[PDB]
Amino acid sequence: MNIFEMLRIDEGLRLKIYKDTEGYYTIGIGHLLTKSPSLNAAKSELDKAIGRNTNGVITKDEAEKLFNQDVDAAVRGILRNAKLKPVYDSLDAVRRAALINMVFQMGETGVAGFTNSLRMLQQKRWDEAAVNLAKSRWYNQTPNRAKRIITVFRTGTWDAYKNL
Numbered sequence: 001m002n003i004f005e006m007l008r009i010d011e012g013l014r015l016k017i018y019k020d021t022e023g024y025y026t027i028g029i030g031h032l033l034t035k036s037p038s039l040n041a042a043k044s045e046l047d048k049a050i051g052r053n054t055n056g057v058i059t060k061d062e063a064e065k066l067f068n069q070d071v072d073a074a075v076r077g078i079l080r081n082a083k084l085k086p087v088y089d090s091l092d093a094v095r096r097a098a099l100i101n102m103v104f105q106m107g108e109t110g111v112a113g114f115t116n117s118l119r120m121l122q123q124k125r126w127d128e129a130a131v132n133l134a135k136s137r138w139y140n141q142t143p144n145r146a147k148r149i150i151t152v153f154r155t156g157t158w159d160a161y162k163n164l
């Protein structure tokens with residue numbers, strides 16, 4: 001298991017524009033196109049991202065290309081964030097993947113707002129961090145996924161993704 005395989009499981013792979021769990025146009029492996037309700041606006045974003053005039057459909061290789069970019073961007077964002085960097089640096093590789101997953105799903109900003117949870121993770125207070133993480137709109141809106149992420153921060157293992 002690794003961050004790519006983990007997010008491939010959480011996000012799935014769809015080659016045609018679809019709406020994410022929040023109702024936003026997206027494509028590939030969780031690549032958010034826009035928050036706009038205009039499908040045309042979404043298609044415009046898709047073409048700019050791929051570099052060609054698409055028919056709202058991309059190839060697997062193109063989906064993977066955007067995914068690679070997206071994962072790198074999430075890591076990059078963590079490293080640039082004063083609230084997230086310290087926590088990330090304090091973690092082991094498995095838990096770091098859990099944090100990257102959260103940032104890919106919610107954005108740097110979103111994650112940096114989990115102040116209390118972040119502090120517990122940095123203190124290595126696993127069970128308490130787990131309980132705190134669950135007290136969120138994130139957990140309530142995407143409970144199955146949140147539960148997997150929380151178990152990885154709790155245990156430092158990939159067991160939650162075993163058999164998916």
Ligand SMILES: [Cl-]
Binds near residue numbers: 049066069
């Ligand atoms: Cl992009």
Ligand SMILES: [Cl-]
Binds near residue numbers: 141142144146
């Ligand atoms: Cl979920």
Ligand SMILES: [K+]
Binds near residue numbers: 021
């Ligand atoms: K998705």
